[PDB]
Design a protein around this nucleic acid. Sequence first.
DNA 1: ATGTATACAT
DNA 2: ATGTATACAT
Lengths: 239, 238
Amino acid sequence: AATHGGRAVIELREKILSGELPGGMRLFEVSTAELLDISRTPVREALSRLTEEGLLNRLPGGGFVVRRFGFADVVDAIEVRGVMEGTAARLAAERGVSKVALEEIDATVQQLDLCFGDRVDDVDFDGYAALNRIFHHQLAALCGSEMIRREVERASSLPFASPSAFLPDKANIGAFRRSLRGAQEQHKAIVAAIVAREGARAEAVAREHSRTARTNLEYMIREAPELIAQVPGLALISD
Amino acid sequence: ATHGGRAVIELREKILSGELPGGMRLFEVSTAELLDISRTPVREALSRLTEEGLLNRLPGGGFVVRRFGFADVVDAIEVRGVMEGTAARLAAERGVSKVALEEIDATVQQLDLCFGDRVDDVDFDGYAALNRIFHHQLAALCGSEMIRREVERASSLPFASPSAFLPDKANIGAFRRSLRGAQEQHKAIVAAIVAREGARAEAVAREHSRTARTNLEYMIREAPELIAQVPGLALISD
DNA sequence: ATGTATACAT
DNA sequence: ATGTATACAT
Ligand SMILES: [Cl-]
Ligand SMILES: [Cl-]
Ligand SMILES: [Zn+2]
Ligand SMILES: [Zn+2]
């Protein structure tokens, strides 16, 4: 983005996501302007856009604060993504999907199968993460509803709430590596349930799929607390 | 009390009535002149209305009034039901404080007094005011700020609100007679939460959102052009 | 049409 | 510390 407003959005987003501007920190207009070497006006533009994005909260009485996320908020965000993905999957099973959209999502699932070797640790991380992003974008749009697609993507927009969040390409942790086989079995079950018009199953399996991220998070809290801050998308967690 | 704040209220009203139709570009100078204020509180208002979901930011700059069709009304009601079902399920699974259960149960008891001896005999205004309280209490019941925030966001579009197709907005026989069933569901939601029955709490709270969808479907079928005259539906493009 | 800096107000 | 109007820039 070639504008001061636009640059400030990019610069502040990066500082917030990395934990450099921590959750709970008040972002004063004059202080933020001086930090970025611009005036208060492009700063207000940037603060408004970052509030719309959900990285900042507006304070009663004026001003902006970096929205604070503790482990309970991450757990709730992952729960919400799961519920929304479960809705996208159920509505595709209930309302029906076009022949081409089913073929495309089924093709992604078959390609995801090739990321797995003969050993339980033998997984192509980068290949998996790129295809996993595609699968979840396809799932969000599958029932053809613009509103559902929009709400599913919004529920997946916080870095820790993304279907890409706790994957071994972000952080090469044994637990994240070994969680991929199970997650892939769920991708297959989601597509088969949608083809079979099994809305209750499609919802339940897509919702359970989001529990991979929560299980991986719980493993880290218990097994390597300080490593959390070193995992991308988790540096901003206040706890 | 601010120009920014007043402009949010004034523009929201103009959007909800269809005065500023879906697809209309809201220029900074044009909107400033319309509200008799400068561009600065206008940009503040346009940002807040984008967060609310009544406007979209355009890729090359500017704001446009978000277009809503009938498919959007059905989808928004579906999403509110799913979110309310989640708030209900998490309260049942995690548990609720003694005071929060007492407060929501008090609202339900107050809602019982809106009903008479005849099936049509219902206090519409009393019901709608208490219904808003119940749904705000349900959203906050499990004590999670994130859930509360997301449930409220899913209930913010006029046609997606738990108040949307009630007889105080539009006195239609079907809307009147749907209230007894909806009240039995409020009682079932609270009892399922007290009993830690998360699957029941979710199912009952989700079904409770189907009252609005059933009432909408009734109007489309039985009185199609009367829909516009229903508040919160005047902005629907279809 | 919007971006940007700033004076002036509470 | 920010709400607000406005001149001037892009
Ligand atoms: Cl939409
Ligand atoms: Cl200051
Ligand atoms: Zn996945
Ligand atoms: Zn209700």
